Amino acid sequence: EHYIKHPLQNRWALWFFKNDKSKTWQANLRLISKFDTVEDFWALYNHIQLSSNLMPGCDYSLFKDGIEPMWEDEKNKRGGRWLITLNKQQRRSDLDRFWLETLLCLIGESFDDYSDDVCGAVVNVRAKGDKIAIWTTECENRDAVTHIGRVYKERLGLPPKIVIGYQSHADTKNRFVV
């Protein structure tokens, strides 16, 4: 039994974005690799730069295989995102640990039945303040959106003194808050 890699519920794809002004936004999105096992996840995570060490303007994106990390994808166009906004000091304190936790919420299917509503997650490294978001497939499903946001907020360890917002991509305003 000790020779079988541990298969994830889904295959995931990790994307990288670099703000090169000579290309279109979409041409700046690059697929890095895919994995579908625990071991291959850690092999890739241990290979790549921490989000706190990326140049401002880059993104990582982890999405279920077959969902591109853009609003235009069939599974994102009716959806939205749970947004965490980081201040500039939280790049040192919280960015990397929040991001790795977000990645585990995804590959570990941490939102019960509603993990089917998850499309992926995105971290934006920005001089103006970093951002992490979980993208879900349908803003009109209030049960799935709300329960993902409650669990997400607790897995991040945010206190109720903090509130986080859900924004639909079509607007991208707050449609849900937990």
Swiss-Prot record:
Changing residue 126 to E: Abolishes binding to the 4ESE element in mRNAs. One of its GO terms (molecular function) is eukaryotic initiation factor 4G binding. Changing residue 22 to A: No increase in protein levels of ODC1 or CCND1 in NIH 3T3 cells overexpressing the mutant in comparison to a 3-fold increase in cells overexpressing the wild-type. Abolishes stimulation of splice factor synthesis. It is found in: Cytoplasm, P-body; Cytoplasm; Cytoplasm, Stress granule; Nucleus. It holds the Pfam family IF4E. Changing residue 42 to A: Binding to CYFIP1 reduced by 70%. Does not affect mRNA nuclear export or nuclear pore complex reprogramming. Does not affect affinity for mRNA cap. Reduces interaction with LRPPRC. Reduces affinity for PML and viral Z protein. PROSITE patterns: IF4E (PS00813). GO terms for cellular component: chromatoid body; cytoplasm; cytoplasmic stress granule; cytosol; eukaryotic translation initiation factor 4F complex; glutamatergic synapse; nuclear body; nuclear speck. Signal peptide: none annotated. Disulfide bonds: none annotated. Keywords: Acetylation, Cytoplasm, Initiation factor, mRNA transport, Nucleus, Phosphoprotein, Protein biosynthesis, RNA-binding, Translation regulation, Transport. GO terms for biological process: behavioral fear response; cellular response to dexamethasone stimulus; G1/S transition of mitotic cell cycle; mRNA export from nucleus; negative regulation of neuron differentiation; negative regulation of translation; neuron differentiation; nuclear export. MRNA binds at residues 25-26, 71-72, 126-131. Residues 6-9, 42-46, 101-108 are annotated as: EIF4EBP1/2/3 binding. InterPro entries: TIF_eIF4e-like, TIF_eIF_4E, TIF_eIF_4E_CS. Belongs to the eukaryotic initiation factor 4E family. eIF4F is a multi-subunit complex, the composition of which varies with external and internal environmental conditions. It is composed of at least EIF4A, EIF4E and EIF4G1/EIF4G3. EIF4E is also known to interact with other partners. Interacts with EIF4ENIF1/4E-T; promotes recruitment to P-bodies and import into the nucleus. This is Eukaryotic translation initiation factor 4E. It comes from Mus musculus. The lineage of its organism: Eukaryota, Metazoa, Chordata, Craniata, Vertebrata.
